[PDB]
Amino acid sequence: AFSAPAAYLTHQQKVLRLYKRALRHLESWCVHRDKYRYFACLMRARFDEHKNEKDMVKATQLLRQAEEEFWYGQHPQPYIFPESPGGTSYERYECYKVPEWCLDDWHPSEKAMYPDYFAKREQWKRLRRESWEREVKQLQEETPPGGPRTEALPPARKEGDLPPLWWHIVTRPRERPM
Amino acid sequence: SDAPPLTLEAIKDRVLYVLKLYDKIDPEKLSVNSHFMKDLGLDSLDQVEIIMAMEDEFGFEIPDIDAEKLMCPQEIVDYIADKKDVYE
Amino acid sequence: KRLFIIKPSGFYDRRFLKLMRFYILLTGIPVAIGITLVNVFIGEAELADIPEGYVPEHWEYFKHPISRW
Amino acid sequence: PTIRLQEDPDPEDENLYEKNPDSHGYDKDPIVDLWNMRVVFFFGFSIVLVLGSTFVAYLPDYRMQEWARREAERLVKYREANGLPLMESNCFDPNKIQLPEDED
Amino acid sequence: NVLQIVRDHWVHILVPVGFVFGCYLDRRSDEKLTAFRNKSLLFKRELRPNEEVTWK
Amino acid sequence: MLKIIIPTTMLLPMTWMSKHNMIWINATVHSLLISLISLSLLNQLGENSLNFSLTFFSDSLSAPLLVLTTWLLPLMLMASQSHLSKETTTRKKLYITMLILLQLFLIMTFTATELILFYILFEATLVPTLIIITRWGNQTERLNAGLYFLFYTLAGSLPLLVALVYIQNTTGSLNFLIIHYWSHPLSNSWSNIFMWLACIMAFMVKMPLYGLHLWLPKAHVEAPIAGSMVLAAVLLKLGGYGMMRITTILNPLTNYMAYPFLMLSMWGMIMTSSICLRQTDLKSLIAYSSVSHMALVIVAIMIQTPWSFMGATALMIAHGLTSSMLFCLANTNYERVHSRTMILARGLQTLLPLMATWWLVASLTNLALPPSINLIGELFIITASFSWSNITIILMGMNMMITALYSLYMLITTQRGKYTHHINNIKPSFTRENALMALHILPLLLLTLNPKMILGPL
Numbered sequence: 001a002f003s004a005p006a007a008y009l010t011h012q013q014k015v016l017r018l019y020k021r022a023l024r025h026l027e028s029w030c031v032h033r034d035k036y037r038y039f040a041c042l043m044r045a046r047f048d049e050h051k052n053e054k055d056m057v058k059a060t061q062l063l064r065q066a067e068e069e070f071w072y073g074q075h076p077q078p079y080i081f082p083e084s085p086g087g088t089s090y091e092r093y094e095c096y097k098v099p100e101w102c103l104d105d106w107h108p109s110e111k112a113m114y115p116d117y118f119a120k121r122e123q124w125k126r127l128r129r130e131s132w133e134r135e136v137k138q139l140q141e142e143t144p145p146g147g148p149r150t151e152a153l154p155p156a157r158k159e160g161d162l163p164p165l166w167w168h169i170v171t172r173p174r175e176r177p178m
Numbered sequence: 179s180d181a182p183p184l185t186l187e188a189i190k191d192r193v194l195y196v197l198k199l200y201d202k203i204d205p206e207k208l209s210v211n212s213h214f215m216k217d218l219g220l221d222s223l224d225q226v227e228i229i230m231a232m233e234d235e236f237g238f239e240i241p242d243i244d245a246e247k248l249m250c251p252q253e254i255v256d257y258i259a260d261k262k263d264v265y266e
Numbered sequence: 267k268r269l270f271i272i273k274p275s276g277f278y279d280r281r282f283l284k285l286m287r288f289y290i291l292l293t294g295i296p297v298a299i300g301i302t303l304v305n306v307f308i309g310e311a312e313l314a315d316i317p318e319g320y321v322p323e324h325w326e327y328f329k330h331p332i333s334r335w
Numbered sequence: 336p337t338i339r340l341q342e343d344p345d346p347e348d349e350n351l352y353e354k355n356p357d358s359h360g361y362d363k364d365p366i367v368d369l370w371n372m373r374v375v376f377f378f379g380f381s382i383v384l385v386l387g388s389t390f391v392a393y394l395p396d397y398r399m400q401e402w403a404r405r406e407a408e409r410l411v412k413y414r415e416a417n418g419l420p421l422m423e424s425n426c427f428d429p430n431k432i433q434l435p436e437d438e439d
Numbered sequence: 440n441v442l443q444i445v446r447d448h449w450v451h452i453l454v455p456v457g458f459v460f461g462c463y464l465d466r467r468s469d470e471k472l473t474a475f476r477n478k479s480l481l482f483k484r485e486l487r488p489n490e491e492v493t494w495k
Numbered sequence: 496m497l498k499i500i501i502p503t504t505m506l507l508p509m510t511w512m513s514k515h516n517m518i519w520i521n522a523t524v525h526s527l528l529i530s531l532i533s534l535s536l537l538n539q540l541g542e543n544s545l546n547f548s549l550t551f552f553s554d555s556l557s558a559p560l561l562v563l564t565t566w567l568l569p570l571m572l573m574a575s576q577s578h579l580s581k582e583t584t585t586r587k588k589l590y591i592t593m594l595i596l597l598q599l600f601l602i603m604t605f606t607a608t609e610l611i612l613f614y615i616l617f618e619a620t621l622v623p624t625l626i627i628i629t630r631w632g633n634q635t636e637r638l639n640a641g642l643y644f645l646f647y648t649l650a651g652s653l654p655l656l657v658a659l660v661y662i663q664n665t666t667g668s669l670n671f672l673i674i675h676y677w678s679h680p681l682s683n684s685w686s687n688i689f690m691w692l693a694c695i696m697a698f699m700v701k702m703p704l705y706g707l708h709l710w711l712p713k714a715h716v717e718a719p720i721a722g723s724m725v726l727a728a729v730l731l732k733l734g735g736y737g738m739m740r741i742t743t744i745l746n747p748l749t750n751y752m753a754y755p756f757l758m759l760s761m762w763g764m765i766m767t768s769s770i771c772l773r774q775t776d777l778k779s780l781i782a783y784s785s786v787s788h789m790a791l792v793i794v795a796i797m798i799q800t801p802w803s804f805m806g807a808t809a810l811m812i813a814h815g816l817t818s819s820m821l822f823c824l825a826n827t828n829y830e831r832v833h834s835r836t837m838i839l840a841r842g843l844q845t846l847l848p849l850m851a852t853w854w855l856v857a858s859l860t861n862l863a864l865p866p867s868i869n870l871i872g873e874l875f876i877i878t879a880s881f882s883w884s885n886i887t888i889i890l891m892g893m894n895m896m897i898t899a900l901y902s903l904y905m906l907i908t909t910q911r912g913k914y915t916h917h918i919n920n921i922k923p924s925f926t927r928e929n930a931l932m933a934l935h936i937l938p939l940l941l942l943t944l945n946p947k948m949i950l951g952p953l
């Protein structure tokens with residue numbers, strides 16, 4: 001969610017992702033801890049049995065067969081962490097998330113409460129206004145002529161710079177806003 | 179009320195606690211900056227198992243693209259703190 | 267610790283609701299009081315036979331005082 | 336000129352809350368705005384809504400529902416007293432009707 | 440000082456005056472349809488010792 | 496009933512003599528007063544109509560329509576003054592003049608005693624609507640919309656005119672009372688069939704009937720907000736009122752001339768409800784909703800029973816209020832984001848809670864939640880159709896399932912989910928908009944409290 005994706009996944013990445021998926025589904029099948037540990041050690045042995053195959057074609061064939069076996073033997077109802085995309089609390093608190101710009105529309109009577117908070121907010125807004133043009137200039141310099149090729153962004157490099165395009169990442173609402 | 183307000187020290191303590199219960203890592207030789215591959219001499223499968231153990235410890239999932247990059251306990255602690263809005 | 271909770275401005279909706287309640291009540295409390303006072307102290311008419319030779323007014327063919335008025 | 340015509344640029348939209356934080360959304364003039372709000376609320380809710388509902392609720396019975404109920408009560412009482420059928424299938428007296436002479 | 444007030448708010452009598460004029464014209468229209476006043480078989484009635492017409 | 500007509504004609508110079516910054520206040524105040532005066536027409540009899548003069552009369556069918564018209568004028572004024580702020584004083588006065596002239600024409604149309612006077616006023620309503628659409632609409636399509644609005648109407652109404660004058664040469668009168676008392680049956684000949692079609696098609700295209708409805712999405716989408724309000728709430732009901740008036744001379748031909756129109760109405764009600772499920776423009780969805788409800792009204796008028804007539808009257812009133820409210824609700828979002836695409840602005844319940852409550856109530860009345868008068872009209876029509884044929888409950892039933900779906904779909908798309916991140920110009924709701932929503936919705940429930948006022952002469 002945080003890292004910029006690459007153009008493709010490598011063979012090692014696919015093997016590791018299959019290993020994690022297989023272990024998770026095996027834990028879903030093996031509810032008890034000791035049984036899961038036993039069969040997970042067996043699965044790890046089965047995985048590292050073919051770790052030293054120098055023929056890449058045979059390696060991809062083995063990966064293909066393993067993925068077919070996984071799809072046949074997957075748990076139809078695997079365990080999902082409650083806040084994971086399939087969980088029971090996945091987007092539960094999205095209705096409580098309010099963007100910060102709404103605070104600009106508060107009536108002055110509402111802003112009369114919380115004076116110090118709004119003074120700090122004004123300081124942050126001043127910082128963003130002072131940093132924007134330098135961020136844009138740094139992005140203009142660091143970008144190759146044929147446009148960017150990845151979604152990775154550079155850090156700040158100068159004396160008192162800020163990493164470009166930082167406002168909406170830094171001022172995230174919260175994970176439990178209200 | 180609900181769960182206490184998790185702090186950075188608690189996160190680091192639990193991460194180190196999980197790591198010292200791993201039989202492939204020497205407890206004394208382990209520090210918060212030790213690299214899994216260079217310092218500790220583990221391979222990628224061990225790193226996947228470590229990430230899964232962290233997920234079980236803290237009750238949430240770390241996506242594969244983010245989990246591949248974590249290489250020392252400090253990165254794990256920082257990722258967990260950033261995810262859970264921990265600042266103290 | 268106590269944290270600031272970001273919400274949209276609730277001032278204007280509350281103001282509108284208060285204004286609507288005020289005006290509705292401003293005209294509807296006197297109406298309710300008047301209806302109650304009329305009902306208590308000027309009841310409904312009682313049905314009766316038309317006396318011989320009498321031609322009632324049209325509003326005399328209804329029983330509630332407000333309807334008659 | 337690489338242009339097609341001389342035109343004004345499309346202007347940004349004005350926020351009524353900027354010059355009047357409590358603006359009611361009726362007019363840019365605060366006093367005219369406030370009085371527009373007041374007249375709308377007084378003549379829409381106070382006068383038409385509540386008083387009109389009260390006027391309609393107490394409208395006199397020109398539909399003659401109660402009159403019809405009382406007439407039906409008298410008719411039922413009389414017919415049940417004398418043993419006549421409550422209602423007749425004919426609403427017009429046949430002695431006032433002249434059927435055609437021949438049906439063949 | 441009522442000069443400015445009148446010249447600013449004299450447009451507020453047009454609609455009430457129109458309402459009154461419409462009522463008057465409706466009464467005038469009713470005045471032209473009295474050909475069967477107190478003459479229908481259902482409502483024909485003997486006049487009271489004082490009243491002149493049954494309705495206006 | 497000049498006590499209602501003359502005050503509107505007085506609204507005209509009152510608007511044209513007002514100070515530049517008092518036009519809206521004066522127009523709104525005196526429009527509300529005229530509505531209060533027109534409230535007295537609801538005192539109706541059980542036997543005949545209120546015959547004011549040789550020219551005007553009031554029935555139990557036209558009085559709620561007049562009340563709705565006079566009540567809709569101030570709401571239109573309130574909804575229009577936001578997007579007309581930059582306009583010049585003369586053009587604002589001209590816009591208000593168009594609205595006033597439309598109200599006057601509608602008021603005289605609903606109370607005319609003769610059919611040719613009714614025809615003249617019912618065509619005269621065309622000019623202000625067309626001017627409003629083509630002069631104050633926002634996009635370039637408005638011009639095309641205007642053309643679609645005009646000719647679709649006139650191609651229906653020009654035959655009717657001919658039929659009308661023909662009838663006056665045969666019976667000697669077009670007075671509605673004389674026409675009703677001296678009614679004679681229509682024989683089964685080709686001439687009578689074409690007379691029936693000439694008498695029916697204009698009202699059919701006004702409803703509109705499915706297949707003749709293409710003008711409506713264009714005209715109701717391209718119009719300004721007041722134009723859409725008056726098009727959906729009142730101008731569609733001209734067809735139903737005219738059909739219920741004209742059917743008194745078409746028996747017993749209707750007994751079999753209604754079949755193609757009944758089939759079109761039922762199947763096209765299903766079709767337009769289905770169309771509402773895949774719509775990217777929020778205004779077009781509301782327009783197709785209007786088409787489905789009017790198909791129900793057409794079925795009710797065509798089967799010609801007392802229960803169907805009561806249901807048709809109730810449904811017309813309820814739909815007018817509900818569709819006007821829905822158009823205003825969509826216009827608030829459009830004025831905020833300047834786009835009619837439904838999925839552009841989402842999660843608006845988080846930003847505007849009271850407006851979300853208004854949305855919920857409007858969508859609840861659209862799906863005819865009991866005991867709303869929407870549901871009363873729909874249920875009366877469904878019961879009458881069941882008496883007409885037991886199989887209709889299938890199609891009607893399907894409609895009831897689809898309506899709710901798309902209705903809730905609309906709500907779920909606009910109010911729920913997460914807000915769009917890049918839209919940062921969503922200001923809090925103004926008092927004017929909340930008051931507009933309340934003045935739409937409160938009369939609906941108040942009418943539920945006393946439903947016999949909108950059930951018609953039957």
Ligand SMILES: CCCCCCCCCCCCCCCCCC(=O)OC[C@H](COP(=O)([O-])OCC(O)COP(=O)([O-])OC[C@@H](COC(=O)CCCCCCCCCCCCCCCCC)OC(=O)CCCCCCCCCCCCCCCCC)OC(=O)CCCCCCCCCCCCCCCCC
Pocket residue numbers: 286287290291293294295297298301302303305306309310330384385386388389392937
């Ligand atoms: C909040 C705003 C926010 C926005 C919201 C939107 C608002 C929109 C509003 C729009 C405008 C609306 C206007 C509509 C106009 C309609 C008015 C109307 O027609 O009135 C009708 C009706 C009056 O009818 P009526 O024709 O005038 O009466 C005919 C008779 O002549 C009369 O009979 P009577 O001779 O016996 O006299 C009775 C008299 C006196 O009766 C009594 O005194 C007896 C009562 C019992 C007392 C007995 C014991 C108590 C005393 C004992 C102790 C003291 C004595 C001993 C002392 C020592 C102590 C030991 O009382 C009355 O006169 C009736 C009350 C008057 C109410 C009028 C309503 C006007 C409202 C208009 C304003 C609208 C806005 C609302 C604002 C209003 C202010 C809040 O008023 C009622 O509502 C009555 C309802 C109460 C009946 C009981 C309820 C039965 C429940 C059954 C259902 C069960 C299901 C559960 C649901 C329950 C939920 C309720």
Ligand SMILES: CCCCCCCCCCCCCCCCC[C@@H](O)O[C@H](CO[C@H](O)CCCCCCCCCCCCCCC)COP(=O)(O)OCC[N+](C)(C)C
Pocket residue numbers: 330383384387388389391392393534559560562563566812938941942944945949
């Ligand atoms: C914001 C907070 C909301 C919740 C809080 C609310 C607090 C409580 C208030 C809610 C009250 C609950 C309503 C319960 C009903 C009680 C009133 C009821 O009994 O009165 C009805 C009366 O209601 C009225 O008749 C209906 C109102 C008329 C509607 C006209 C609306 C005004 C015109 C506005 C413009 C028109 C646009 C629509 C065009 C068609 C009954 O009529 P009826 O059974 O006979 O009475 C018999 C005795 N009489 C005849 C002597 C009087």
Ligand SMILES: CCCCCCCCCCCCCCCCC[C@@H](O)O[C@H](CO[C@H](O)CCCCCCCCCCCCCCC)COP(=O)(O)OCC[N+](C)(C)C
Pocket residue numbers: 683684685688704705706707752755756
């Ligand atoms: C897109 C939607 C537009 C709006 C929809 C409008 C619907 C209009 C449809 C008209 C309904 C019926 C019209 C006439 C009634 C019967 C028609 C005919 O088919 O029935 C038979 C008629 O018999 C034959 O069919 C002769 C008619 C055949 C010629 C008509 C051309 C129809 C072909 C389809 C053309 C499409 C027309 C619509 C264009 C848009 C009945 O036999 P018969 O008892 O003897 O005739 C009754 C009349 N009598 C008693 C005087 C003799």
Ligand SMILES: CCCCCCCCCCCC(=O)SCCNC(=O)CCNC(=O)[C@H](O)C(C)(C)COP(=O)(O)O
Pocket residue numbers: 011012013015016022025026046047048049050051052053059060062063066067069070071073074075221222223
């Ligand atoms: C729920 C039940 C369904 C599950 C069934 C699953 C069945 C599959 C079991 C067998 C699958 C295999 O072994 S597939 C065998 C695949 N073998 C190879 O690719 C050889 C080349 N080696 C490498 O790529 C790396 O060493 C790598 C291995 C990635 C380690 O990564 P690191 O060292 O850099 O961390």
